[PDB]
């Protein structure tokens with residue numbers, strides 16, 4: 022029995038391994054999520070085949086309430102597990118079964134260093150500095166749904182002018198921050214990774230919410246609870262902490 | 275059916291209300307967990323009866339492998355939910371079904387201010403300053419079972435001399451920190467609560483692990499996934515954060 026694991030390319034979770042000759046199967050990939058999969062399969066004793074999600078999406082609902090991405094792969098039983106930086110959210114948890122979190126994160130702000138900006142409130146009350154998030158990701162959704170006045174104000178701005186302040190993916194966001202007067206609303210784990218490698222960038226303020234990434238399984242999956250117990254074991258042994266350090270640590274600034 | 279909720283007195287999660295007359299039922303109690311219970315029952319539409327765990331324990335095993343505390347109340351179906359600072363752990367998650375976490379924490383160190391101690395390593399390296407944890411809690415268990423060299427060394431110390439370095443509860447640990455040359459290994463959420471109120475105490479170093487508290491339900495319970503979904507809703511609405519601020523805010527310290 023070989024489990025199908027849906028995932029998505031995202032540094033440093035899942036990356037194409039560098040090679041001068043064609044690579045095949047699981048050997049095509051490396052990263053934090055490949056290391057996690059190895060540790061999980063060690064503990065639980067399953068074989069697995071990693072498969073990139075065909076539409077290249079994480080999982081959001083459209084106008085008609087239809088799902089896409091890795092979430093949809095789980096719902097349709099085309100995958101057994103999703104192992105990726107898949108944010109645990111209310112809307113997703115209703116349609117798939119998440120394991121307990123293997124990594125914590127919060128939404129925060131990525132911006133260049135040396136400015137007087139110190140919080141989301143600072144961005145909210147002005148219009149000169151543009152700010153946004155990855156379109157249709159869980160960060161954008163948090164702002165779209167929030168009733169906290171500061172975050173409603175930010176969503177009004179982000180969604181204005183045909184969402185010109187939003188970006189298609191994190192890399193586009195990062196380049197926009199580097200080049201123009203732009204701040205990106207980004208998950209703190211990704212911010213840590215980026216600021217380890219771009220000495221001109223920094224996190225602005227603290228975390229505005231509190232959540233995590235979990236392994237996704239279809240509703241009713243017998244693996245969900247086993248995966249959860251494996252994750253708790255890895256946490257208590259210090260292994261999740263070591264894995265993060267391995268993939269996050271940059272060359273120093 | 276009205277759900278039976280097992281819990282335990284622990285400030286500021288669950289406390290006796292102050293009044294001029296005897297109190298009865300749920301009206302006996304107030305605190306973070308009662309607020310959480312109220313929000314959960316409002317979302318899910320259940321009634322509830324809060325019942326203090328008869329043995330006054332959180333949940334661990336004896337040599338025979340029999341569980342006690344709130345964990346045991348769930349295993350035997352004497353309670354439908356456990357709402358308390360019940361730490362999500364490997365051994366416990368095997369025998370009950372935890373919801374997703376409603377609060378994060380990690381083990382850290384409570385000590386007096388103004389000293390050069392800055393990490394668990396600084397403590398493990400010496401024998402002058404005593405250090406310990408609450409007996410039989412998840413913090414003690416972390417040390418007992420760790421294979422990390424520094425934490426092994428620390429467990430050797432803690433367990434020595436018939437565990438004279440351990441304490442029976444947090445209040446005892448806090449007084450020992452205040453009175454003697456002693457550092458208490460304590461969940462960061464509780465450290466935060468104490469240090470907001472006593473400027474003589476501080477947290478030393480960072481969190482040495484990463485976990486959370488979850489609502490406990492018996493294995494197979496239909497309520498676990500519903501409670502999880504309610505908790506995500508409360509988190510995303512900013513309500514869990516507000517609730518923490520309501521109960522944790524002291525004056526703070528310079």
Ligand SMILES: O=S1(=O)NCN(C2CC2)c2ccc(F)cc21
Nearest residue numbers: 122125231232233374376377378
């Ligand atoms: O999305 S969760 O399962 N529940 C919400 N929480 C916050 C502690 C309330 C957290 C905090 C850290 C996580 F890793 C996961 C979660």
Ligand SMILES: O=S1(=O)NCN(C2CC2)c2ccc(F)cc21
Nearest residue numbers: 121123124125256375378485486
């Ligand atoms: O006990 S858990 O469900 N899984 C372990 N983790 C650590 C992020 C790995 C966390 C982190 C924060 C929590 F609130 C719960 C948990």
Ligand SMILES: C=C(C)[C@H]1CN[C@H](C(=O)O)[C@H]1CC(=O)O
Nearest residue numbers: 079106107108155158159160208
């Ligand atoms: C990298 C992307 C687009 C993902 C990763 N976690 C979030 C999710 O699971 O929706 C997205 C980021 C974000 O929305 O800030």
Ligand SMILES: C=C(C)[C@H]1CN[C@H](C(=O)O)[C@H]1CC(=O)O
Nearest residue numbers: 332359360361411412413414461
């Ligand atoms: C207050 C107590 C004894 C509890 C709270 N959570 C931990 C548990 O659920 O085991 C214990 C604290 C600790 O072990 O530091």
Ligand SMILES: [Cl-]
Nearest residue numbers: 120121373374
């Ligand atoms: Cl769960």
